[PDB]
Design a protein around this ligand. Structure first.
Ligand SMILES: C[C@@H](O)CN1CCN(CC(=O)O)CCN(CC(=O)O)CCN(CC(=O)O)CC1
Ligand SMILES: C[C@@H](O)CN1CCN(CC(=O)O)CCN(CC(=O)O)CCN(CC(=O)O)CC1
Ligand SMILES: [Cl-]
Ligand SMILES: [Cl-]
Ligand SMILES: [Cl-]
Ligand SMILES: [Gd]
Ligand code: NA
Length: 128
């Protein structure tokens, strides 16, 4: 599924992401746009053999099981395929554990380089 901007904001707001660990809703929508272009089905292979999955590009090294990342952890206890669903519940619960782990939203390279320090409220501007 490819989300609309307002559609994604209303779903992330419903699953409790708004001000989660002090990160306003605009930070999350911004990250999604530049990680996945709002597409739940996005996948990108890393050079160390691990893969990034779904709308927030969560990494198989630490967070989910894809059966082809040797000696990796599964700290969200989900198959990677669960992160590609039209329902973003799995992606959101998984992201809550990542942003809680010490480095905050710096875990998302595109958030660090394209959202941090910018007018992030612009991303939910006009949404009900
Ligand atoms: C809402 C409308 O803007 C739709 N829109 C009309 C055309 N726009 C005109 C403009 O945005 O001022 C220019 C192109 N636009 C550039 C950009 O948005 O940064 C990329 C395509 N957009 C992507 C999007 O808007 O999400 C969809 C088409
Ligand atoms: C050409 C215009 O589209 C100018 N536009 C600024 C104003 N936009 C317009 C809008 O989308 O309504 C609103 C804010 N916007 C939200 C979003 O696009 O998702 C983020 C910034 N964008 C990023 C991008 O377009 O890739 C910069 C270019
Ligand atoms: Cl915001
Ligand atoms: Cl594996
Ligand atoms: Cl933080
Ligand atoms: Gd824009
Ligand atoms: Na794994």
């Amino acid at each position: 599924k490819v989300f609309g901007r307002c559609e994604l904001a209303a779903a992330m707001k419903r699953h409790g992401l708004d001000n989660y660990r002090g990160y306003s809703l605009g930070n999350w929508v911004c990250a999604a746009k530049f990680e996945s272009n709002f597409n739940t089905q996005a996948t990108n292979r890393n050079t160390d053999g691990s893969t990034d999955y779904g709308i927030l590009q969560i990494n198989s090294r630490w967070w989910c099981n894809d059966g082809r990342t040797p000696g990796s952890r599964n700290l969200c206890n989900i198959p990677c395929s669960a992160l590609l669903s039209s329902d973003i519940t799995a992606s959101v619960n998984c992201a809550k554990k990542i942003v809680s782990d010490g480095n905050g939203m710096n875990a998302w390279v595109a958030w660090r380089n394209r959202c941090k320090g910018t007018d992030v409220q612009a991303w939910i501007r006009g949404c009900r």
